[PDB]
């Protein structure tokens, strides 16, 4: 069919540059103008650039002029914008879409886009990756309130991109809280997922937390005691 | 090619494309609906898909809504005086549609110039680029900067959102040359479904009669397009579309004579057709 | 340059009831050129409507609006559970801050628990104190800390989580990070939570040491 | 790049007979068994043709003038003739005509080149791979305000280095339009052209629309290994034979076959036999006396007789 494949994007220091490229298939892209918009983590998506079918002209946004440049190649077949300099308010996922061309007299473009890429997340920052810390999170007595309870795991000074978790080889969920992981001072990602299990459960079968971390394939399983 | 192009040259230093050597269709141009402005002089919109011209001088430019009415015979103004001057008896037409959407960068655009002061009048299709600096006091110019000494040039600055008469707008203009010589450009022309063993007029190539067309067995050399008897009389057309000889035979016709008695005797009447097959009679 | 202000910024409506979103944009020289999008939390934008009257392909009968002016309406004829979504207006070159619809419910009262920081964390140089608000509905509330009987701000964050689509609940966690030189220096460590649904704030005390 | 070189022999040029041929179809009319007589610009039976050679050394090709209509034929196999010039000052004032049939393309340009003066080819057979391939393209300096141009698609060329094939041309500009007509025919001698009818057909027909007043031929050359000299003096190629003639405004009676092809021709202003047959209609004529012409005595001289006055009139 036809989609748009984001490639590029990662951890990069702030004042430094990048590349982003968006390869298409199944469409006639040389006819069809171009667009490159961006959304926050949370917040409501951006718009950053334009392009021409030759791939000449462009009206670089107030927050992106400057520092970004597109370039539109007609025979490879995909799309480029290289970002200078950038400040730590970039930090987005990035998408680029189509414009609506009629094809008639003129061209016309419509200002409007009809299909969205599959993007990718850039992220400046001064940090630098780092093993995350865990320790289990399991009540005591007197802070577990009836039958019912909730026992989960807290990741700290975990700045790479955001790690999933697992219980028991992903066995069982029981309601799942995905806890998304929220930015804290010197740049630390943390989040903490809690599963609502009973307390009066743990004895028979064992309990094992698998925080599965792909960016430097530091896997790390816990085992969570009832104190 | 020229008009889909996303270019579009200053007008002071306007685009000129020549055209020539191909076929026009104006009539598809003008029903298609996506242009805002379209004016002609010397001529009307319908026609223009009748006739052949020898050459036609495309001219291509961006300015603002409140100034299309400056591309017109007999006009002044900044751009009819400074840019862009075409005769009184200019011969073509003048279309222009909105572009804002597509020549407009933020906070004004400078990369579209026009000429503010000019030491004299414009020739009608005359192109001048120039860039000694305009005097218009006491004090030197035309090479130093000085008191009211400014650049004989200035910049529309199209921004994003402006009004109507501010928003750039995409105008060409075509001329058109009524000069006696070979002619390059014309309408289309149009064929139709073609007929046989009947009564029928037929155009071939500016070859125009009336009779029947049957397939043939003669042999034209391969350029030859039609045929003639002794007495120099079409008898052959070869078709333009299927490269196929037809034999042309004029519609059958004849006396009518009538054949009768004394009115005395008798009224009754008899008819001869002659040369007439009686197939063909009703 | 356009500025797109949806209005509400937060719409709470039942599962059947339906309800109408407003948009006011800067400067309405639009002629009618709007687009409409919902977007799940979780995935990329879907377009919804065009021209601001008409639908495209695949959008159900009920998703229609119309408007005209800087007060651009789009209508919902009724309700599913697939609203837990954020709506997105767009003119050419501006988008709008968004809009979430939330399935209501009656209120809840939350539970929060507090966790200290272990041993493993003790050792480590920084001290974290984690409180868990659990099954609180509806979204609105503030959580304070309480060091040494003495409240302070400033030095704490707070998380949300998206509503669950089980039950419609959701979860707030906030941690407290200090270094452990501060730490020993106090012994008692509370967390007040207020809420309108509530008779009165709770108020949790912790001591230091555990026992 | 212009380069002016001449190592030829110096020698009058030859004469010689065009014969009965030279004739081409008039018009795209198809006539069968009917004997039609026309009244256009053709080449005159039994002409006065000029004759130029290429031999190797002669590499005659001067700027002869365009008179109205030209006769053409080449006689060669090395195909060292490839296109001709026309125009009025053969430079960038004035519009002129050029076309080339080089190696792999058949180029019809109408611009105001800057001709050089020595306009021709060249073609570097190296032995490395034993190829031909035209090195040299030396025909004019700038190439501007071209107006109207056509490239047939393009024909690969053996271009071989030595008069078995017989290429006539027909030049005839008029009415704005330049026709070319265009026959090619197997040629068993290698010295003069056959003594055979032959017709030409139209080829092409190109509305240029200038004055066409002096036209000159285009040669290429074929040094591979024989010239030790520098590209000024030195140079090698085939043999190459070429006539032109001049078209005349004629009368002539056309005989068509039942397949619609010109068999046979006939000039009317040529001998008494040739005007009586125009005058019957017919290839034969019987025996007996025939009326044809009027003779006139055409006066010699012109003389004038007014009054021997010499004042002014009033009209101060
Ligand atoms: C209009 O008048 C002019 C000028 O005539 C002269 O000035 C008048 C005011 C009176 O004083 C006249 O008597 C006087 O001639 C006439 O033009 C003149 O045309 C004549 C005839 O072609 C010229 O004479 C010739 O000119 C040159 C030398 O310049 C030589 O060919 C001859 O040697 C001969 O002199 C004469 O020069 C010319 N006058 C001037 C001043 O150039 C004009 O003819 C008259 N209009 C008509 C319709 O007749
Ligand atoms: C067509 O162009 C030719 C080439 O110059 C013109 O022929 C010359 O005309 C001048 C006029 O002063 C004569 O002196 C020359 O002798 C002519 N040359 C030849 C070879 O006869 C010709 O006049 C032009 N015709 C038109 C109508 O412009
Ligand atoms: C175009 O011309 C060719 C040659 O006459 C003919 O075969 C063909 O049908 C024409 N195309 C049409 C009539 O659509
Ligand atoms: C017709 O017939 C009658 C009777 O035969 C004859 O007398 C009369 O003259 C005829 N009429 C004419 C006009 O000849
Ligand atoms: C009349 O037409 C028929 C049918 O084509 C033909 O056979 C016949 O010879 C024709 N008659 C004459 C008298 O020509
Ligand atoms: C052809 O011209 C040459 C010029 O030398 C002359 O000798 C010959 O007699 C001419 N033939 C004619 C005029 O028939
Ligand atoms: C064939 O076309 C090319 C490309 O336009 C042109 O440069 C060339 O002159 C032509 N061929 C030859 C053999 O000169
Ligand atoms: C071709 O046009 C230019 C300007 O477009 C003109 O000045 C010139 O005279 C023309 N070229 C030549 C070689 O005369
Ligand atoms: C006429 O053409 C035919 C083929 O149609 C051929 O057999 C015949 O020989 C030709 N006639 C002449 C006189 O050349
Ligand atoms: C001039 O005319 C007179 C009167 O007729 C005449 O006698 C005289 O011979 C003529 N002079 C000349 C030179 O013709």
């Given at each position: 069919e036809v989609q748009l494949v984001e490639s590029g994007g990662g951890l990069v220091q702030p004042g430094?540059?990048?590349?982003?490229?968006?390869?298409?298939?199944?469409?006639?892209?040389?006819?069809?103008?171009?667009?490159?918009?961006?959304?926050?983590?949370?917040?409501?998506?951006?718009?950053?650039?334009?392009?021409?079918?030759?791939?000449?002209?462009?009206?670089?946004?107030?927050?992106?002029?400057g520092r970004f440049?597109?370039?539109?190649?007609?025979?490879?077949?995909?799309?480029?914008?290289?970002?200078?300099?950038?400040?730590?308010?970039?930090?987005?996922?990035?998408?680029?879409?189509?414009?609506?061309?009629?094809?008639?007299?003129?061209?016309?473009?419509?200002?409007?886009?009809?299909?969205?890429?599959?993007?990718?997340?850039?992220?400046?920052?001064?940090?630098?990756?780092?093993?995350?810390?865990?320790f289990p999170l399991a009540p005591s007595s007197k802070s577990?309130?009836?039958?019912?309870?909730?026992?989960?795991?807290?990741?700290?000074?975990?700045?790479?991109?955001?790690?999933?978790?697992?219980?028991?080889?992903?066995?069982?969920?029981?309601?799942?809280?995905?806890?998304?992981?929220?930015?804290?001072?010197?740049?630390?990602?943390s989040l903490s997922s809690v599963v609502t299990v009973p307390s009066s459960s743990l004895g028979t079968q064992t309990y094992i937390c698998n925080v599965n971390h792909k960016p430097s394939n530091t896997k790390v399983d816990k085992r969570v005691e009832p104190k | 090619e020229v008009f889909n192009a996303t270019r579009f040259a200053s007008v002071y230093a306007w685009n000129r494309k020549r055209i020539s050597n191909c076929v026009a269709d104006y009539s598809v141009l003008y029903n298609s609906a996506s242009f805002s402005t379209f004016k002609c002089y010397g001529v009307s919109p319908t026609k223009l898909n009748d006739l052949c011209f020898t050459n036609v001088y495309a001219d291509s430019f961006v300015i603002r809504g409140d100034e299309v009415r400056q591309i017109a015979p007999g006009q002044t103004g900044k751009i009819a005086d400074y840019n862009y001057k075409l005769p009184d008896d200019f011969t073509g037409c003048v279309i222009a549609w909105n572009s804002n959407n597509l020549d407009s960068k933020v906070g004004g655009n400078y990369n579209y110039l026009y000429r503010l002061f000019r030491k004299s009048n414009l020739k009608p299709f005359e192109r001048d680029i120039s860039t000694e600096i305009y005097q218009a006091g006491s004090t030197p110019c035309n090479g130093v900067e000085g008191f009211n000494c400014y650049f004989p040039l200035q910049s529309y600055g199209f921004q994003p959102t402006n009004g109507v008469g501010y928003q750039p707008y995409r105008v060409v203009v075509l001329s058109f040359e009524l000069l006696h010589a070979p002619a390059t450009v014309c309408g289309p022309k149009k064929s139709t479904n073609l007929v046989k063993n009947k009564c029928v007029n037929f155009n071939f190539n500016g070859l125009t009669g009336t009779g029947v067309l049957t397939e043939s067995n003669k042999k034209f050399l391969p350029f030859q397009q039609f045929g003639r008897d002794i007495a120099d009389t079409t008898d052959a057309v070869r078709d333009p579309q299927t490269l196929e000889i037809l034999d042309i035979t004029p519609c059958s016709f004849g006396g009518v004579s009538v054949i009768t008695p004394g009115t005395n005797t008798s009224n009754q009447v008899a008819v001869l057709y002659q040369d007439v097959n009686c197939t063909e009679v009703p | 340059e356009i500025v797109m202000t949806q209005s509400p910024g937060t719409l709470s409506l039942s599962p059947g009831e339906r309800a109408t979103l407003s948009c006011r944009a800067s400067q309405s020289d639009s002629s009618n050129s709007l687009a409409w999008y919902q977007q799940e939390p979780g995935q990329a934008p879907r377009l919804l409507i065009h021209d601001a009257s008409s639908r495209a392909?695949?959008?159900?009968?009920?998703?229609?609006?119309?408007?005209?002016?800087?007060?651009?309406?789009?209508?919902?004829?009724?309700?599913?559970?697939?609203?837990?979504?954020?709506?997105?207006?767009?003119?050419?070159?501006?988008?709008?801050?968004?809009?979430?619809?939330?399935?209501?419910?009656?209120?809840?009262?939350?539970?929060?628990?507090?966790f200290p920081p272990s041993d493993e964390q003790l050792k480590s140089g920084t001290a974290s104190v984690v409180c868990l608000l659990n099954n609180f509905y509806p979204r609105e509330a503030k959580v304070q800390w309480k060091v040494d009987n003495a409240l302070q701000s400033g030095n704490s964050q707070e998380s949300v989580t998206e509503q669950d689509s089980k039950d419609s609940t959701y979860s707030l966690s906030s941690t407290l990070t200090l270094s452990k030189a501060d730490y020993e220096k106090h012994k008692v460590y509370a967390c007040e939570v207020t809420h309108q649904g509530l008779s009165s704030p709770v108020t949790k005390s912790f001591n230091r040491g555990e026992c | 790049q212009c380069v002016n070189l001449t190592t030829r022999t110096q020698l009058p040029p030859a004469y010689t007979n065009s014969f009965?041929?030279?004739?081409?179809y008039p018009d795209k009319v198809f006539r069968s068994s009917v004997l039609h007589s026309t009244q256009d610009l053709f080449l005159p039976f039994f002409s006065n043709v000029t004759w130029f050679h290429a031999i190797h050394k002669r590499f005659d090709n001067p700027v002869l003038p365009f008179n109205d209509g030209v006769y053409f034929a080449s006689t060669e196999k090395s195909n060292i003739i490839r296109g001709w010039i026309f125009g009025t000052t053969l430079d960038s004032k004035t519009q002129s005509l050029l076309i080339v049939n080089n190696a792999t393309n058949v180029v019809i340009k109408v611009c105001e080149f800057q001709f050089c003066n020595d306009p021709f080819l060249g073609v570097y057979y190296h032995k490395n791979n034993k190829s031909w391939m035209?090195?040299?393209?030396?025909?004019?300096?700038?190439?501007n305000n071209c107006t109207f141009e056509y490239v047939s698609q393009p024909f690969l060329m053996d271009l071989e280095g030595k008069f078995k094939n017989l290429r006539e041309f027909v030049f005839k500009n008029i009415d704005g339009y330049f026709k070319i007509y265009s026959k090619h025919t197997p040629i068993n001698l290698v010295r003069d052209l056959?003594?055979?009818?032959?017709?030409?057909?139209?080829?092409?027909?190109?509305?240029?629309?200038?004055?066409?007043?002096?036209?000159?031929?285009?040669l290429a050359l074929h040094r591979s290994y024989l010239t030790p000299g520098d590209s000024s003096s030195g140079w090698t190629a085939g043999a190459a034979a070429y006539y032109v003639g001049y078209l005349?405004?004629?009368?002539?009676?056309?005989?068509?076959?039942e397949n619609g092809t010109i068999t046979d021709a006939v000039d009317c202003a040529l001998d008494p036999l040739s005007e009586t047959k125009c005058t019957l209609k017919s290839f034969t004529v019987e025996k007996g006396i025939y009326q044809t012409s009027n003779f006139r005595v055409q006066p010699t001289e012109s003389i004038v007789r007014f009054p021997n006055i010499t004042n002014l009139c009033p009209f101060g």
């Open positions: 430094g540059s990048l590349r982003l490229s968006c390869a298409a298939s199944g469409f006639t892209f040389s006819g069809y103008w171009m667009h490159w918009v961006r959304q926050a983590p949370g917040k409501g998506l951006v718009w950053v650039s334009r392009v021409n079918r030759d791939g000449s002209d462009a009206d670089y946004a107030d927050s992106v002029k440049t597109i370039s539109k190649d007609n025979a490879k077949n995909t799309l480029f914008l290289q970002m200078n300099s950038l400040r730590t308010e970039d930090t987005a996922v990035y998408y680029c879409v189509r414009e609506a061309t009629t094809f008639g007299v003129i061209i016309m473009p419509e200002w409007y886009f009809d299909l969205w890429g599959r993007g990718t997340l850039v992220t400046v920052s001064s940090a630098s990756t780092k093993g995350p810390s865990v577990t309130s009836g039958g019912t309870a909730a026992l989960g795991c807290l990741v700290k000074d975990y700045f790479p991109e955001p790690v999933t978790v697992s219980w028991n080889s992903g066995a069982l969920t029981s309601g799942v809280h995905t806890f998304p992981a929220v930015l804290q001072s010197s740049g630390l990602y | - | 392909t695949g959008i159900p009968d009920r998703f229609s609006g119309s408007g005209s002016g800087t007060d651009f309406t789009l209508i919902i004829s009724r309700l599913e559970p697939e609203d837990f979504a954020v709506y997105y207006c767009q003119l050419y070159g501006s988008f709008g801050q968004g809009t979430r619809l939330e399935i209501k419910r009656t209120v809840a009262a939350p539970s929060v628990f507090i | 009965t041929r030279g004739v081409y035209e090195s040299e393209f030396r025909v004019y300096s700038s190439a056959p003594q055979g009818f032959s017709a030409l057909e139209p080829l092409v027909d190109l509305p240029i629309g200038i004055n066409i007043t002096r036209f000159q031929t285009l005349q405004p004629r009368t002539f009676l056309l005989k068509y076959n």
